């Protein structure tokens, strides 16, 4: 509930504007940011088959998009990012995922740890 | 139509042909965006085969969704990114066509059979932009990708 | 567009400058459209001035 509300609105706002994503090279920063964010969130809703996700894993991925950490990343690399990102947080940061489910939300401490994992990880991934 | 509609569920692989494609001279007239197979699965055909096939379908669906907009507003309105995927998609459409041995009396071209490895390689290369410099027509009605390259030289002089 | 109907590229997207007129002049009545209102329009150094004026209108 703490991440889905935002994603819903940002996608809804994106839907009003998406028609000129390949035709809106000139328009102002506000509508440029709607397209940039919305295209990113759309990629985060893509999913492979036969691997349904725990809720904590879902919210960790939606968190990265909605807090803007993927706004500079090339859209076509997002699915590849998520696969590797999720495998990294599951393999090594099981304490963080446990805490997200323990608390029943992403706390300040969880937000801080997530920011450092995502931002550093993204730098390495887009090299 | 109830007859073919009811038939789909009985199949593992469907090849759907289209008059709109045949009418362009694209033979075999397979709709790349309406043909499916149970085994089109990264776990079955390997990730390389799957990725190129999905990549091909994406570029073709992207072009199809643009076609009508640029028929009115003009190609010139597109970013170099969009018009790059237009030119690429039109080459991929053409590289999907193929002269059949049984169709020599219709095509005027010798029949060609293309190994799976070469099919995968050819589409991979076109997607990667490795033939962005070649004319559209070099890709039409050939077998392997080498014949497109060879056709490009022949169409020059 | 002037050459495709009948050479310089990259004109019109960003507003024209005197630097644009200089580039044209250095390579070498003028015919342009003169702005009237939202709807209406009509068809050594001072040589670069005249290319510039025809660009701004």
């Amino acid at each position: 509930k703490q991440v889905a509300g935002t994603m819903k609105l940002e996608l809804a706002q994106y839907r009003e504007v998406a028609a000129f994503a390949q035709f809106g090279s000139d328009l102002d920063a506000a509508t440029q940011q709607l397209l940039s964010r919305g295209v990113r969130l759309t990629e985060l809703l893509k999913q492979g088959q036969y691997s349904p996700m725990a809720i904590e894993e879902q919210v960790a991925v939606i968190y990265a998009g909605v807090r803007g950490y993927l706004d500079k990343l090339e859209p076509s690399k997002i699915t590849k990012f998520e696969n590797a990102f999720l495998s990294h947080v599951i393999s090594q940061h099981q304490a963080l995922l446990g805490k997200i489910r323990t608390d029943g939300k992403i706390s300040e401490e969880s937000d801080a740890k997530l920011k450092e994992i995502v931002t550093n990880f993204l730098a390495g991934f887009e090299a | 139509d109830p007859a073919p509609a009811t038939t789909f569920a009985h199949l593992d692989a469907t090849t759907v042909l289209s008059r709109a494609i045949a009418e362009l001279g694209i033979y075999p007239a397979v709709d790349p965006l309406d043909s499916t197979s149970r085994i089109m699965d990264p776990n079955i055909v390997g990730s390389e085969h799957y990725d190129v096939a999905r990549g091909v379908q994406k570029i073709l669906q992207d072009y199809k969704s643009l076609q009508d907009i640029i028929a009115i507003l003009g190609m010139d309105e597109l970013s170099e990114e969009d018009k790059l995927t237009v030119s690429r998609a039109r080459k991929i459409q053409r590289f999907l066509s193929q002269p059949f041995q049984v169709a020599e009396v219709f095509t005027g071209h010798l029949g060609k059979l293309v190994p799976l490895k070469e099919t995968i390689k050819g589409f991979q290369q076109i997607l990667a932009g490795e033939y962005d410099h070649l004319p559209e027509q070099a890709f039409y009605m050939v077998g392997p990708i080498e014949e497109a390259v060879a056709k490009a030289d022949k169409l020059a002089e | 567009k002037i050459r495709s109907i009948l050479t310089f590229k990259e004109v019109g997207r960003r507003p024209p400058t005197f630097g644009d007129a200089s580039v044209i002049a250095l390579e070498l009545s003028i015919i342009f459209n003169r702005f009237r209102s939202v709807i209406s329009y009509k068809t050594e150094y001072s040589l670069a001035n005249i290319i510039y004026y025809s660009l701004k209108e």
Binding site: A19, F20, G24, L27, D28 | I69, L73 | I50, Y52, K56
Partner: protein, 47 residues
């Protein structure tokens, strides 16, 4: 004449209506810049 054909045209002309509207407003942002900048360039072009 076919619902298929009309559905394709409707998708197409909905895209166009949204884009042409965006172009009318982008040009507005460009013409607002152009009209102000035309002021000094007009008295300058006299000579």
């Amino acid at each position: 004449a076919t619902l298929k054909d009309i559905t394709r045209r409707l998708k197409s002309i909905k895209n166009i209506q949204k884009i042409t509207k965006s172009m009318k407003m982008v040009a507005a942002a460009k013409y607002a810049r152009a009209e102000r900048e035309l002021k000094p360039a007009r008295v300058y072009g006299v000579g």
